[PDB]
RNA sequence: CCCGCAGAAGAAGCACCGGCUAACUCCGUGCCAGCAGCCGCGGUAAUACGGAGGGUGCAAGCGUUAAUCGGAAUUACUGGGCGUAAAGCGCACGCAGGCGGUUUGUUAAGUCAGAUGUGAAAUCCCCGGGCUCAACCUGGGAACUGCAUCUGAUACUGGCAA
């Protein structure tokens, strides 16, 4: 299923960086971004229609860290869906559970609170959760389980998540530990940066 | 990042108010700008500087400092671009109708002194005809060969050429400049706030300026075509 | 040998709009001075007039707003090798709804917009786009 | 501001005493993103000046064509030279979903969202002449109005 | 066109013919392989094609490439027929599926290796 | 299904990297060995063969083969053509077939509108619900592009009369 490999090769293939680890520090200065992603890194290539689409498609799914076949039930979920199809995509996206529990703050990457998702110690409801792609409703209750709760990593994670950006679709209270959905973010919610007409028009091919 | 360049902050107690989003007063009563917010400004500068240098525009690069004089003549002679950097006449892109004809008395004068009449009439006669072209060879000799008006203006101090801000805002060009603590960034369209008055910084941030133009002209595009 | 007038009168409609002429002129029938003047309803066509007694003739001056026709595109549907016949949900809508499909229902001939809100369909006899 | 766009070079022949002398075309469509486009083909020696003609005449060469909300008015057809072009206004489409060398020309006029379907010939010259047709043949409510019926609320009902 | 023609004789449909006449919607066929040999290609590639023919388990006796570089196959040996032409011989249409039932696989392969079936060199 | 114990411990391959088509260098070989879906590569400096490194895609799968549709407007009803590209009978008369100027009246067959019965359930689609989510199951609807009958409309087409 899951990548688990080098995860900031990734973000040097995509170029832009992708917030794929914790950002304690920044972007490290110690990968070399933004000028290699192999042996030929240097050698900067065309990238052509086709691959502007591709890279795009590529830079999402590493984002959120869904594959091919998922993401691919996620267009079609979108496209039978009413209203606009890439907003209904990204929503679709924003709305997994490890999404909804990095965007409270309850991990520092999504690898990680996928591991806390995956773990059987984060609750939606006041019920238990073991699956990484729940799609949470809007007005619900994200919480932590009492075994988990208060090792060293939520303190960690959330202490870093300070400073990142604080998504206003959804509360936190990080004492408690909980976070009510509250509605589902519009495009104009989410860093303008992915570009969801090269996806939609890439599966629309 | 501190770089490599030490462009930390600034002067002491004569900033202009409208920075205080830049500010951290330091224990010797001395401003620091704030270095995590400078470098989105900077890269925000630059992804306008390969827009227009790759819409193949002119760049006029103007700084004098009696300190960044030659880094921006070194700095900018690596490009294909343009500079202002010993001396800013009043007037050379609002009143560049005028400013012409004194082009056109320096190009046409080094091409009757390179080779023609520089010994012809008096040894008197060179003394003037040469000394009046080392003294338009440093006010015009960077901007002798654009014959236009500019598309962008990279000033590196708006508090010392201030009026070249205002001199590209009476006309629409869009300046940006790299701001003092003292300096005001209100003409100014991409400030970048930093530190005016440190070689290395003019080395600094005129050299990336000076890789985002001649990295940024195509040179993959046209090798494609080719 | 002239089986369908109607495609004779559109012909005549298309080939002065084309020729930049005044008027046309065409032998008339109650079903031309009944498609005219829904055309004049509409608008792409002003002062249709029937002039005769017992061969008569009907004429149409032909509208110029511009340097430019008006009469941009006029299609021939319900032909009588092909005739066309649709419901009230089914009628078309000619250039997106701004131009005009003209159809001939029970309640006379008249255009689609009209048949919608009329709640009945026909045969559609053109379209002016 | 402009937002140029190459679509295709081709490498083109002569055929001298000598030998067989080499040339290229570009083509390029330009355009704001408000409904101007033009095109240029320009041909030269080598491939930038080739690109670098195919701007200058593409800038001298733009055509008005009258757009809301980024998509079509209405489902317009064209043809130039054997390339039959059908486009679509797709209202929410989502996506610019064209083929080949319309593609470009449609996503520098600034429809952001059509369904557009090339029928007959596919070379790109007669294509995008093909399209830059069927976008100057589209009018507008506002346009149709003014020449016929007189009222926005009459013609669109 | 004429609507009327139409309507009095029907618009006929184009009828496909199988590349693959070696027993129709099958993917494989098993064959017998008599006389493995050698055919030079056409005109302008040059070399020793390594082709056997083959009588199948139907009847038909169809002649097919063998893949890889060098083989075993010596006039009995009983092996699986895939599909597929070469382009470069006249008639060959089809091919033996390497490492299937006799036609085992390719020595010192590590590239592609689900194609000529080479196993995993572990140890 | 839940609780507890143990320790990152038991768990990643497959195809491809000349163009189409995302991803490039070296070495081995020398129109050989081989590759190939179509163009086509291989004659000593092969990004196309074989190996290595690096990369790209998909992932408990990956690729090949077979088969259907698409792309194919490449049998065109939607939606093509026929001077020279494939294609106008050598030219007519002419039965069946198809099509038919214009006005009035009648009919209501075609046509249109409504209603009723039927078009099984499952399946597709919409709004929900339940399985920790999903696949899956399921409630209600929509639809089932139709057929028959009754009631009307009579602009067009047809039948009849003038």
């Not at chain 5, 009095?8 to 693959?20: E, F, L, Q, T």
């Not at chain 5, 696989?105 to 590239?111: A, L, N, S």
């Amino acid at each position: 299923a899951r990548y688990l490999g080098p995860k900031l090769k990734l973000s040097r293939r995509e170029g832009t960086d992708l917030f794929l680890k914790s950002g304690v520090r920044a972007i490290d200065t110690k990968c070399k971004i933004e000028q290699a992603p192999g042996q030929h890194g240097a050698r900067k290539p065309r990238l052509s229609d086709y691959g502007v689409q591709l890279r795009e498609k590529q830079k999402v799914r590493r984002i959120y860290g869904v594959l091919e076949r998922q993401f691919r039930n996620y267009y079609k979920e979108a496209a039978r869906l009413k209203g606009n199809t890439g907003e209904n995509l990204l929503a679709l996206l924003e709305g997994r559970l490890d999404n909804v529990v990095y965007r409270m703050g309850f991990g520092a990457t999504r690898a990680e609170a996928r591991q806390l998702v995956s773990h059987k110690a984060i609750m939606v409801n006041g019920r238990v959760v073991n699956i990484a792609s729940y799609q949470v409703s809007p007005n619900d209750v994200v919480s932590i389980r009492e075994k988990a709760k208060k090792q060293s990593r939520v303190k960690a994670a959330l202490e870093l998540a300070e400073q990142r950006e604080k998504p206003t679709w959804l509360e936190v209270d990080a004492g408690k530990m909980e976070g009510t959905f509250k509605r589902k973010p519009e495009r104009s919610d989410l860093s303008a940066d992915i570009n969801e007409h090269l996806i939609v028009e890439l599966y629309s091919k | 990042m501190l770089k490599a360049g030490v462009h930390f902050g600034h002067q002491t107690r004569y900033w202009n108010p409208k920075m205080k989003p830049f500010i951290f007063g330091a224990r010797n009563k001395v401003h620091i700008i704030n270095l995590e917010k400078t470098v989105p400004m900077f890269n925000e500068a630059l992804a306008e500087l390969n827009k227009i240098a790759s819409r193949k525009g002119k760049i006029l690069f103007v700084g004098t400092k009696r300190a960044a004089s030659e880094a921006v003549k070194d700095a900018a002679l690596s490009c294909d671009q343009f500079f202002v950097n010993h001396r800013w006449l009043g007037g050379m892109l609002t009143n560049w109708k005028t400013v012409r004809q004194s082009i056109k008395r320096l190009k046409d004068l080094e091409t009757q002194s390179q080779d023609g009449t520089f010994d012809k009439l008096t040894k008197k006669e060179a003394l003037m005809r040469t000394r009046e072209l080392e003294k338009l060879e440093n006010s015009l000799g960077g901007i002798k060969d654009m014959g236009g008006l500019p598309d962008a203006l990279f000033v590196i101090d708006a508090d010392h050429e201030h009026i070249a801000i205002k001199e590209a805002n009476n006309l629409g060009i869009p300046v940006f400049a790299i701001v003092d603590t003292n300096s005001d960034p209100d003409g100014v369209d991409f400030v970048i706030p930093g530190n005016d008055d440190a070689i290395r910084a003019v080395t600094l941030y005129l050299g990336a300026v000076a890789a985002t133009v001649r990295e940024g002209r195509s040179q993959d595009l046209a090798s494609q075509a080719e | 040998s002239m089986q369908d007038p109607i495609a004779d009168m559109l012909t005549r409609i298309r080939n002065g709009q084309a020729a930049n002429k005044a008027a046309v002129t065409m032998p008339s029938s109650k079903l031309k001075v009944a498609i005219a003047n829904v055309l004049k309803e509409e608008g792409f066509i002003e002062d249709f007039k029937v002039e005769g007694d017992t061969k008569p003739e009907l004429e149409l001056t032909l509208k110029y707003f511009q340097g430019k026709a008006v009469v941009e595109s006029i299609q021939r549907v319900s032909r009588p090798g092909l005739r066309i016949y649709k419901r009230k949900d089914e009628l078309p809508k000619v250039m997106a709804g701004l131009g005009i499909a003209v159809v001939s229902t029970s309640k006379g001939v008249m255009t689609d917009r009209a048949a919608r809100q009329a709640g009945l369909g026909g045969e559609i006899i053109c379209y002016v786009a | 501001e402009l937002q140029e766009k190459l679509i295709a070079v081709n490498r083109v022949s002569k055929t001298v005493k000598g030998g067989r002398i080499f040339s290229f075309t570009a083509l390029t469509v330009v355009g704001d993103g408000n409904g101007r486009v033009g095109f240029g083909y320009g041909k030269a020696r080598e491939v930038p000046a080739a690109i670098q003609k195919a701007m200058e005449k593409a800038r001298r060469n733009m055509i008005n064509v009258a757009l809301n909300n980024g998509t079509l008015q209405h489902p317009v057809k064209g043809v130039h030279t054997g390339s039959r072009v059908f486009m679509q206004p797709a209202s929410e489409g989502t996506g610019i979903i064209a083929g080949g060398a319309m593609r470009a020309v449609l996503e520098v006029a600034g429809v952001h969202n059509v369904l557009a379907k090339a029928y007959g010939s596919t070379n790109p010259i007669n294509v995008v002449r093909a399209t830059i047709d069927g976008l100057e043949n589209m009018n507008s409510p506002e346009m149709v109005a003014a020449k016929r019926g007189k009222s926005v609320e009459e013609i669109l009902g | 066109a004429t609507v009327n023609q139409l309507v009095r004789k029907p618009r006929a449909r184009k009828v496909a013919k199988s590349n693959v006449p070696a027993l129709e919607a099958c993917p494989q066929k098993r064959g017998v392989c008599t006389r493995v040999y050698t055919t030079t290609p056409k005109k302008p590639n040059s070399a020793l094609r390594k082709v056997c023919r083959v009588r199948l388990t139907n009847g038909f006796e169809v002649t097919s490439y063998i893949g890889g570089e060098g083989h075993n196959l010596q006039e009995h040996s009983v092996i699986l027929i895939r599909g597929g032409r070469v382009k470069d011989l006249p008639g060959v249409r089809y091919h033996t599926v390497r490492g299937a039932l006799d036609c085992s696989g390719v020595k010192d392969r590590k590239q592609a290796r689900s194609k000529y079936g080479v196993k995993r060199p572990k140890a």
